C-alpha cells in the first residue's frame, strides 16, 4: 500500500483547470440588449421554418437496410462493447431530444 500510494499520488495537471476558467471568463458584464431579440438562432430557424419544411420535404430514401442503425454505432445484442454501454447510451439518448 506504501508503493501503491507513492505511485498513485504524483498526478500533475499539465497546466491547470483554473488556467481553463481564468482565460475564458470575461471581466465584462452581461449587458443584455435588443441583441437577444435580434438573433433568431439556427436551431430556432429550424422551428420557425416549420411550414417550409412541412411543405417542401417530399422525397424519401426508398432503399434502406434495417438493423444497420444499431450496428453502425456498435450497440446491438452482441458486440465488443459491454452490456450497459448500450443501456446507458440508449437512456441518455432516450432523454436528450
Amino acid at each position: 500500500v506504501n508503493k501503491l500510494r507513492c505511485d498513485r499520488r504524483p498526478i500533475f495537471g499539465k497546466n491547470l483547470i483554473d488556467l481553463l476558467t481564468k482565460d475564458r471568463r470575461v471581466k465584462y458584464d452581461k449587458s443584455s440588449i435588443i441583441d437577444n431579440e435580434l438573433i433568431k438562432p439556427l436551431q430556432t430557424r429550424v422551428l420557425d421554418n416549420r411550414k417550409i419544411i412541412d411543405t417542401f420535404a417530399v422525397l424519401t430514401p426508398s432503399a434502406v437496410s434495417l438493423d444497420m442503425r444499431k450496428l453502425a454505432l456498435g450497440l446491438n445484442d452482441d458486440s465488443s462493447v459491454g452490456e450497459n454501454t448500450r443501456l446507458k447510451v440508449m437512456q441518455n439518448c432516450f432523454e436528450v431530444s
Binding site: 500510494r5 498526478i11 495537471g13 497546466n15
Partner: protein
C-alpha cells in the same frame, strides 16, 4: 476472441503509472496537484513496519 487471449500477463496497465495525465486537467487544478504531490510520505509505513 482469438485476440482476447491472455494479454494481462504481458501487458502493463499504463493508467496506474500516472501517464494518462492528458486527461488530468478535466478534474484537477494546478495548486491541487502541487499541494497533492508535495504530500506523499514514506516513513509512516516504515514506522508501522
Amino acid at each position: 476472441k482469438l485476440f482476447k487471449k491472455n494479454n494481462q500477463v504481458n501487458r502493463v496497465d499504463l493508467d496506474f503509472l500516472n501517464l494518462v495525465f492528458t486527461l488530468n486537467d478535466k478534474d484537477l487544478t494546478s495548486y491541487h496537484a502541487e499541494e497533492i504531490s508535495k504530500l506523499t510520505c514514506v516513513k509512516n509505513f516504515v514506522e508501522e513496519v
